[PDB]
């Protein structure tokens, strides 16, 4: 059986523009949520988000090519280049057909969708930019990255809303293990902090409205939570077959040992209760990895700080872990970064990997008073030092949609 390892990391997040700077900020419990100022939020119920600060990609993407890209495409390219550079992979004509990508997004290029439609309603179809379609669709992050590096292997783009991150990474490993590729760059990217984004998710009453204190708005499992907080960024991983990585002396962060999927079969407006869908995806990932749940040391929860979803996630962890539920460490890094939607599963897989490397667990900040029935060790406030941790679990849950779970093994 072909094993799949992680040989490269790249990331842009509300708390840092590299992998290590983000990892340092999360372990320090630093928030990355601030007030939006790139558009007038006076008429918006939610006026804050997890923004990428000080973003400068001119060294990678020229200004001419940036205009053909929505911000979420620029993010994924930068994070993809970081991961490719971190992998040290040398693409030749011989191995090009064996290298591909699996990069998706949940909502895609809202910014340039808004701009092109505004030109349309103001000046007709002759004002639509010829780059409108390729600047907005979710598959163009992989499209640009394959062209930049000459990748010819299998390339897909999974768009499953808040679970796109783990799905793209998990099916990149499936493509490698099946034999269709030896290397895949996988992850997701998002930039929904736009008028349509903040307004759209705000129309569905999904966003927190704590405009008076944005750094305390994302509080998973806290009794005062009132919805999730939007977050921008991108996470990219270089997945590689084990023997391929060993032959070239690659750096190996962790091994991807398990990937599970499930569907909830109910709308988000219906009660999730015990989160049977979330438990089903975690069980499939454990069965796929062939390990018991008690061997998991840390679980990077979905934990969006929504009232019903957070409680349903704690029940799903109790079902899967049972006796070991009181011992496993669970934490939501969305308390600091916000909800990166399609990229959430991607950046949170990187956190689960770095948790194995450094034997440290990032905290669930703003967890002042847990809800009734939320009596798990959610690592509140400050980061936790661990030892002997071999497996971590990364979850993306739909609670009204699809679910994805990834299990990583140290070395």
């Amino acid at each position: 059986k072909r094993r799949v390892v992680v040989t490269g990391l790249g990331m842009l997040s509300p708390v840092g523009n590299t992998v290590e700077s983000t990892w340092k900020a999360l372990l320090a419990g630093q928030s990355g949520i601030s007030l939006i100022d790139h558009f007038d939020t006076s008429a918006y119920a939610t006026k804050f988000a997890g923004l990428v600060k000080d973003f400068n990609c001119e060294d990678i993407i020229s200004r001419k090519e940036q205009r053909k890209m929505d911000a979420f495409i620029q993010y994924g390219i930068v994070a993809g280049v970081q991961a490719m550079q971190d992998s040290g992979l040398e693409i030749t004509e011989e191995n090009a057909t064996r290298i591909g990508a699996a990069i998706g997004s949940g909502i895609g290029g809202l910014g340039l969708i808004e701009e092109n439609h505004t030109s349309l309603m103001n000046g007709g179809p002759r004002k639509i930019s010829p780059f409108f379609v390729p600047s907005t669709i979710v598959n163009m992050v992989a499209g640009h990255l394959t062209i930049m590096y000459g990748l010819r292997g299998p390339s897909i783009s999974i768009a499953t809303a808040c679970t796109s991150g783990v799905h793209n990474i998990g099916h990149a490993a499936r493509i490698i293990a099946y034999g269709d590729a030896d290397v895949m760059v996988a992850g997701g990217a998002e930039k929904a902090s736009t008028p349509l984004g903040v307004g759209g998710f705000g129309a569905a009453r999904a966003l927190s409205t704590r405009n008076d204190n944005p750094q305390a708005a994302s509080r998973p499992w806290d009794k005062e939570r009132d919805g999730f907080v939007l977050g921008d960024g991108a996470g990219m991983l270089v997945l590689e077959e084990y023997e391929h990585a060993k032959k070239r002396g690659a750096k190996i962060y962790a091994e991807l040992v398990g990937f599970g999927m499930s569907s909830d079969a109910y709308h988000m407006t219906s009660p999730p209760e015990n989160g049977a869908g979330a438990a089903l995806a975690m069980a499939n990932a454990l069965r796929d990895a062939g390990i018991e749940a008690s061997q998991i040391g840390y679980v990077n929860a979905h934990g969006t700080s929504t009232p019903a979803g957070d409680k349903a996630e704690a029940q799903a962890v109790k079902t899967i872990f049972g006796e070991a539920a009181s011992r496993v460490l669970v934490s939501s890094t969305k308390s600091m970064t916000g909800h990166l939607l399609g990229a959430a599963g991607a950046v949170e897989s990187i956190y689960s990997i770095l948790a194995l490397r450094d034997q440290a667990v990032p905290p669930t900040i703003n967890l002042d008073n847990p809800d009734e029935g939320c009596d798990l060790d959610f690592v509140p406030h400050e980061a936790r030092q661990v030892s002997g941790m071999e497996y971590t679990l990364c979850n993306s849950f739909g609670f009204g949609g699809t679910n994805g779970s990834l299990i990583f093994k140290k070395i």
């Binding site: 020229s62 200004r63 001419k64 090519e65 205009r67 002759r126 004002k127 930019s129 010829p130 780059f131």
Partner: protein, 77 residues
């Protein structure tokens, strides 16, 4: 600022070339590395810059810097 400097500047920003390289005889595709959609976006930028409508049958004849200079000149009257 004169329309030629304005036109040459628009071409410079659109195709990502320094104003030194935006010569009057420069071909968008052959000299300034523009693809077929780059030239379309460039003609749109000329329209929005000068508030003039350029018929797409005339836009196809705008292949060089001098051509864009001539068109914006002889259509401000």
């Amino acid at each position: 600022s004169t329309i030629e400097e304005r036109v040459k500047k628009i071409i410079g920003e659109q195709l990502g070339v320094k104003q030194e390289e935006v010569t009057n005889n420069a071909s968008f595709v052959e000299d300034l590395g523009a693809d077929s959609l780059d030239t379309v976006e460039l003609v749109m930028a000329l329209e929005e810059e000068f508030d003039t409508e350029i018929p797409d049958e005339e836009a196809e004849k705008i292949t060089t810097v001098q051509a864009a200079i001539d068109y914006i000149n002889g259509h401000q009257a």
